[PDB]
Design an enzyme around this catalytic site. Structure first.
Site, PDB file in Angstrom:
ATOM      1  CG  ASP A  87      59.237  69.144  37.225  1.00  0.00           C
ATOM      2  OD1 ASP A  87      59.540  69.702  38.269  1.00  0.00           O
ATOM      3  OD2 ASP A  87      58.083  69.286  36.779  1.00  0.00           O
ATOM      4  CG  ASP A 117      60.397  73.107  41.022  1.00  0.00           C
ATOM      5  OD1 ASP A 117      60.469  71.955  40.590  1.00  0.00           O
ATOM      6  OD2 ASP A 117      59.590  73.932  40.574  1.00  0.00           O
TER       7      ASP A 117
HETATM    8  C1  LIG Z   1      59.514  80.919  29.233  1.00  0.00           C
HETATM    9  C2  LIG Z   1      58.905  79.545  29.556  1.00  0.00           C
HETATM   10  C3  LIG Z   1      59.573  78.403  28.779  1.00  0.00           C
HETATM   11  C4  LIG Z   1      58.968  79.318  31.024  1.00  0.00           C
HETATM   12  N1  LIG Z   1      58.887  80.179  32.079  1.00  0.00           N
HETATM   13  C5  LIG Z   1      58.989  79.575  33.305  1.00  0.00           C
HETATM   14  C6  LIG Z   1      58.912  80.358  34.575  1.00  0.00           C
HETATM   15  N2  LIG Z   1      57.874  79.741  35.384  1.00  0.00           N
HETATM   16  C7  LIG Z   1      56.682  80.572  35.583  1.00  0.00           C
HETATM   17  C8  LIG Z   1      58.056  78.549  35.929  1.00  0.00           C
HETATM   18  O1  LIG Z   1      59.140  78.258  36.362  1.00  0.00           O
HETATM   19  N3  LIG Z   1      57.022  77.777  36.136  1.00  0.00           N
HETATM   20  C9  LIG Z   1      56.975  76.908  37.294  1.00  0.00           C
HETATM   21  C10 LIG Z   1      56.257  75.653  36.936  1.00  0.00           C
HETATM   22  O2  LIG Z   1      55.030  75.571  36.988  1.00  0.00           O
HETATM   23  N4  LIG Z   1      57.130  74.734  36.557  1.00  0.00           N
HETATM   24  C11 LIG Z   1      56.860  73.420  36.044  1.00  0.00           C
HETATM   25  C12 LIG Z   1      57.688  73.348  34.748  1.00  0.00           C
HETATM   26  C13 LIG Z   1      57.135  74.111  33.548  1.00  0.00           C
HETATM   27  C14 LIG Z   1      57.880  74.019  32.373  1.00  0.00           C
HETATM   28  C15 LIG Z   1      57.475  74.639  31.181  1.00  0.00           C
HETATM   29  C16 LIG Z   1      56.287  75.365  31.157  1.00  0.00           C
HETATM   30  C17 LIG Z   1      55.521  75.465  32.328  1.00  0.00           C
HETATM   31  C18 LIG Z   1      55.931  74.840  33.518  1.00  0.00           C
HETATM   32  C19 LIG Z   1      57.285  72.303  37.006  1.00  0.00           C
HETATM   33  C20 LIG Z   1      57.573  72.711  38.469  1.00  0.00           C
HETATM   34  O3  LIG Z   1      58.476  71.762  39.024  1.00  0.00           O
HETATM   35  C21 LIG Z   1      56.345  72.778  39.382  1.00  0.00           C
HETATM   36  C22 LIG Z   1      56.618  73.143  40.858  1.00  0.00           C
HETATM   37  C23 LIG Z   1      55.325  73.313  41.649  1.00  0.00           C
HETATM   38  C24 LIG Z   1      54.682  72.221  42.252  1.00  0.00           C
HETATM   39  C25 LIG Z   1      53.476  72.402  42.974  1.00  0.00           C
HETATM   40  C26 LIG Z   1      52.906  73.671  43.111  1.00  0.00           C
HETATM   41  C27 LIG Z   1      53.547  74.763  42.524  1.00  0.00           C
HETATM   42  C28 LIG Z   1      54.740  74.584  41.795  1.00  0.00           C
HETATM   43  N5  LIG Z   1      55.666  71.495  39.289  1.00  0.00           N
HETATM   44  C29 LIG Z   1      54.345  71.472  39.324  1.00  0.00           C
HETATM   45  O4  LIG Z   1      53.703  72.502  39.529  1.00  0.00           O
HETATM   46  O5  LIG Z   1      53.639  70.219  39.095  1.00  0.00           O
HETATM   47  C30 LIG Z   1      52.244  70.224  39.328  1.00  0.00           C
HETATM   48  C31 LIG Z   1      51.945  69.092  40.256  1.00  0.00           C
HETATM   49  C32 LIG Z   1      52.559  68.597  41.402  1.00  0.00           C
HETATM   50  N6  LIG Z   1      51.895  67.486  41.882  1.00  0.00           N
HETATM   51  C33 LIG Z   1      50.797  67.077  41.182  1.00  0.00           C
HETATM   52  S1  LIG Z   1      50.575  68.120  39.825  1.00  0.00           S
HETATM   53  C34 LIG Z   1      56.270  77.649  38.448  1.00  0.00           C
HETATM   54  C35 LIG Z   1      56.398  76.901  39.764  1.00  0.00           C
HETATM   55  C36 LIG Z   1      56.758  79.089  38.589  1.00  0.00           C
HETATM   56  C37 LIG Z   1      59.144  78.185  33.241  1.00  0.00           C
HETATM   57  S2  LIG Z   1      59.171  77.677  31.589  1.00  0.00           S
END
Ligand SMILES: CC(C)c1nc(CN(C)C(=O)N[C@H](C(=O)N[C@@H](Cc2ccccc2)C[C@H](O)[C@H](Cc2ccccc2)NC(=O)OCc2cncs2)C(C)C)cs1
EC number: 3.4.23.24
Length: 339
Positions: free
Chosen positions: A32, A220
């Site tokens: 990540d 990302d």
């Molecule tokens: C079917 C299922 C397995 C999944 N669908 C997806 C599709 N989606 C919505 C994502 O990609 N989700 C992303 C996410 O949050 N990714 C996460 C990985 C993850 C994995 C599994 C389950 C949930 C999340 C990890 C990503 O690097 C994001 C990027 C980001 C950063 C700041 C603000 C907004 C976005 N990282 C974070 O959000 O970290 C939070 C923080 C940053 N600093 C302090 S806390 C969003 C940015 C869209 C991922 S996993």
């Protein structure tokens, strides 16, 4: 030195295998570039409702004799709503052989997330807050910073080849660069944030038309898709013929006709004459049923995620505050350089 770690293409995320503790317990965790904290699933944790968070391996602090407990609370929330609550600790981490003692992680006892996530961004971006913003631990050395500090890598840097969308493995190297899986020159780009790994995107060419943008975007590894501000994302959806489609109270998502033309390519122009081209198949994502999502979505924050990053080689450098880019080349080949 170089430490090539494999990246498993799970679909939505790319994970590597990490072994943790004295008895080297193997967790598969997401790699990540969006987060800066490394947390794993605990053996005796309750996974959120309807989520199978323990099938990518688990962590049992009691079995590891190196495991030290900080006694500070842990909590993180991800862009899609997944959260993870647990406890701060320290222990041995091994990544394809090499091993760093007393690396601070989070042991998580509840998580609506499907696996642990190895976040490897700027230490300034660590989740050290609770939900009131009140602090629960000092900003700490994360993995990459502990690699360099134990002399595993020379500099806090890494490269990211996720391979073709058909490909099963891609690769990340810590403190090393493959110079065989990109064309052109690697174009260093100044990171625009002392907290996130963002670079100035000037404009995007879509379906032959140019769309001025001018503002930073997060490269990302752990976002699946690509996000833009609603206004911008809207102008883009128009030209491609995507429909915004309410599926929840405040959550919207662009759908697209499953049989839309995707022979085109979508271009991303960055600051130094850097250019990355993405083929349009990356903008139809399949939902199990007979619908297809657009690979571009709206959001407060811009994110170039997996569907963009497949198509670039990337030399992240956290001690430089640069991320170099070059159009991606796919091959079995390779040639590394311990920067
Ligand atoms: C079917 C299922 C397995 C999944 N669908 C997806 C599709 N989606 C919505 C994502 O990609 N989700 C992303 C996410 O949050 N990714 C996460 C990985 C993850 C994995 C599994 C389950 C949930 C999340 C990890 C990503 O690097 C994001 C990027 C980001 C950063 C700041 C603000 C907004 C976005 N990282 C974070 O959000 O970290 C939070 C923080 C940053 N600093 C302090 S806390 C969003 C940015 C869209 C991922 S996993």
């Amino acid at each position: 030195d170089s430490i090539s770690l494999s990246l498993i293409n799970e679909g939505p995320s790319y994970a590597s295998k990490v072994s943790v503790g004295s008895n080297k317990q193997q967790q598969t965790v997401i790699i990540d570039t969006g987060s800066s904290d490394f947390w794993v699933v605990d053996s005796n944790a309750q996974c959120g409702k309807g989520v199978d968070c323990k099938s990518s391996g688990t962590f049992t602090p009691s079995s590891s004799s190196s495991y030290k407990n900080l006694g500070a609370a842990f909590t993180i929330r991800y862009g899609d709503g997944s959260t993870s609550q647990g406890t701060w600790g320290k222990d041995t981490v091994t990544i394809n052989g090499v091993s760093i003692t007393g690396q601070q992680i989070a042991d998580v006892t509840q998580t609506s997330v499907d696996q642990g996530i190895l976040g490897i961004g700027y230490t300034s971006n660590e989740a050290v807050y609770d939900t009131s913003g009140r602090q629960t631990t000092p900003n700490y050395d994360n993995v990459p910073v502990t690699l360099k500090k134990q002399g595993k890598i020379r500099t806090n840097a890494y490269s990211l080849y996720l391979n073709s969308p058909s490909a099963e493995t891609g690769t990340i190297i810590f403190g090393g660069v493959d110079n065989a899986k990109y064309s052109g020159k690697l174009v260093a780009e100044q990171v625009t944030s002392s907290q996130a790994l963002t670079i100035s995107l000037a404009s995007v060419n879509l379906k032959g038309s140019s769309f001025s943008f001018g503002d930073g975007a997060l490269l990302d590894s752990g976002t699946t898709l690509t996000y833009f501000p609603s206004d911008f994302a809207a102008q883009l959806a128009d030209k491609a013929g995507a429909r915004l489609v309410q599926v929840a109270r405040d959550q919207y998502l662009y759908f697209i006709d499953c049989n839309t033309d995707t022979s085109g390519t979508t271009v991303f122009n960055f600051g130094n004459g850097a250019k990355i081209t993405v083929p349009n198949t990356e903008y139809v994502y399949q939902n199990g049923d007979g619908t297809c999502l657009w690979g571009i979505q709206p959001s407060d924050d811009t994110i170039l995620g997996d569907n963009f990053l497949r198509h670039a080689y990337l030399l992240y450098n956290l001690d430089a505050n640069t991320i170099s880019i070059a159009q991606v080349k796919y091959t079995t080949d390779s040639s590394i350089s311990a920067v």
